[PDB]
Ligand binder design. Structure first.
Ligand SMILES: N[C@H](CCC[C@H](N)C(=O)O)C(=O)O
Ligand SMILES: N[C@H](CCC[C@H](N)C(=O)O)C(=O)O
Lengths: 320, 320
């Protein structure tokens, strides 16, 4: 049948969310997990990542769930040569480059590669584009949280001396309300979000770790940053959740008439929504290839019906 | 240059909104208005609709701004044979049929036809699809207003004896809040919207007109309907606006974790946002055809980047 044979590459939080979610897909079959490790805390079969070539015939889509600001750039293209790949690559400054290289790779193999999926990048990206396209004269703002930013949390974890750490992005409600009225055109994303950190570290390292957090380009400089050092027991019991979300707000004027477009996401578990998007886009990638296409593609180049497990005609008869 | 020669067919509220808005498009040129009437309250050149064939060489896209529940079904296909057409056909039960016929017509002429655009159908349709696709187990509700429904207002105007009339769709805020919590799964759209009518008519016709409103299939039966008869002076001074909007709310569970997706529109002028969408989709239709495609297409089959006046690479470098 047209049941999409799928495999996951890597096995952290995201890989784990994708695994449990692939089960609720009516047209997908998890064939296994490709890992560097021989044993893994799962019932799902595991193969050495180095034996992908041997499985390149039993797997339709390769969900790249390993990487962050490292393993995806270096490793992602190698996988494009064996199957259709879907990644959630979120380094915004590098997305254009990452897509150029993935493209050469995918087109060269005759398979499709969907890059930088998720909710941001991903769902928020699509929303920014549609609203800005439809409203000729517009103002647009993207707000995150309140909630745990995965990108900022692991940036904190890479700082020598940091044992455990979490980062909460907190948006200004005033800014939020002003953006809805079209009164936030003089404000940028750095002025409308406070970044709150909770870090476990030896007291001897506090001064150094704090300066390192505050002067970290891209992630923290330019932002109002709060740094909280707590003992490990407090970290462990009070910071267990992973909620997140945000708003993409666009306003536009059509001649003395204001229009407000707002997309909102309230997620109880951050990696679970990222995996859900990554999955629907893997269904699209196969459809795109199965219908003859190749190379890299951003979420901006996929027609919405390609993500739906449903027949196009049912969608037009029920959803339009 | 690649400045899209465009023309408008018809000239009511929508045609009028499209005209003023085409001016703020950086890549479009209004060539004229095709009308049944010789004279029109505009500076824009007007041609007899019957002379479209003579202009089929000077016009790239034909914005169909005439029709509603009549002129579009009968007339829309004739125009597909002369240029790319964009319509805002909103008869939900007939959209699938309307697209089948438009398709034969467009494919037969080698040009593209974008059907049923606007905000609903249109923007709300896209949102229903994405959220339902990404969230495997989901609940979805569409709320309208508060505001003036154009479809229901002109349905009222067709009732013999009705001189003037307006209809306001009012959604239940309780339902709204319950949908955000995932507690509205037992409710339908008929139970969550009250339909409020303001009608001018001779007092002799009130009883008959009211029964006709209440028993009108599709538009009013099944809904809680309020009918208000007012004098014309009151109608004229107090019911001049055309605001509208709504929410598409989807919830989903990923294993004990809830996710809420909400798309909201607050429009100060209803036809102005419909025209803004219709316009961006006319830019896409040309791109689709200019890149070799033909037949009818719903908003579900257009990749988002096709609506943006901007270069794809700028979008990926700035918006992803
Ligand atoms: N930059 C955003 C987060 C985006 C979402 C996802 N990419 C993540 O890292 O959680 C924030 O500051 O909270
Ligand atoms: N059925 C919706 C309206 C959709 C929007 C647009 N199609 C219009 O007629 O205004 C309502 O009841 O208010």
């Amino acid at each position: 049948m047209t049941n999409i044979r799928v495999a996951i590459v890597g096995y952290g939080n995201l890989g784990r969310s994708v695994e449990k979610l692939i089960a609720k897909q009516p047209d997908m079959d998890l064939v296994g997990i490709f890992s560097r490790r021989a044993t893994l805390d799962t019932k799902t079969p595991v193969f050495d990542v180095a034996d992908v070539d041997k499985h390149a015939d039993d797997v339709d889509v390769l969900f790249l769930c390993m990487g962050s600001a490292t393993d995806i750039p270096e490793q992602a293209p190698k996988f494009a040569q064996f199957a259709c790949t879907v990644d959630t690559y979120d380094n915004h400054r590098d997305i254009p480059r990452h897509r150029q290289v993935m493209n050469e790779a995918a087109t060269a193999a005759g398979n499709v590669a969907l890059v930088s999926t998720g909710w941001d990048p991903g769902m928020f990206s699509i929303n920014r584009v549609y609203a800005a396209a439809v409203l000729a004269e517009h103002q647009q703002h993207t707000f995150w949280g309140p909630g745990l930013s995965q990108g900022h949390s692991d940036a904190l974890r890479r700082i020598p001396g940091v044992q455990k750490a979490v980062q909460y992005t907190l948006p200004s409600e005033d800014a939020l309300e002003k953006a809805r009225r079209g009164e936030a055109g003089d404000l940028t994303g750095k002025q409308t979000h406070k970044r709150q950190c909770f870090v476990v570290a030896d007291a001897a390292d506090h001064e150094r770790i704090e300066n390192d957090i505050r002067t970290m380009p891209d992630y923290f400089v330019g932002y109002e940053v709060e740094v909280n050092f707590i003992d490990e027991a407090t970290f462990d019991s009070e910071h267990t959740g992973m909620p997140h979300g945000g708003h993409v707000i666009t306003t536009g004027d059509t001649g003395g008439f204001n229009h407000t477009v707002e997309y909102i996401l309230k997620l109880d578990r951050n990696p679970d929504f990222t995996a859900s998007s990554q999955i629907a886009f893997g269904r699209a990638a196969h459809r795109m290839k199965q219908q003859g296409q190749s190379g890299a593609f951003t979420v901006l180049e996929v027609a919405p019906y390609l993500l739906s497990p449903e027949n196009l005609d049912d969608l037009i008869a029920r959803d339009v």
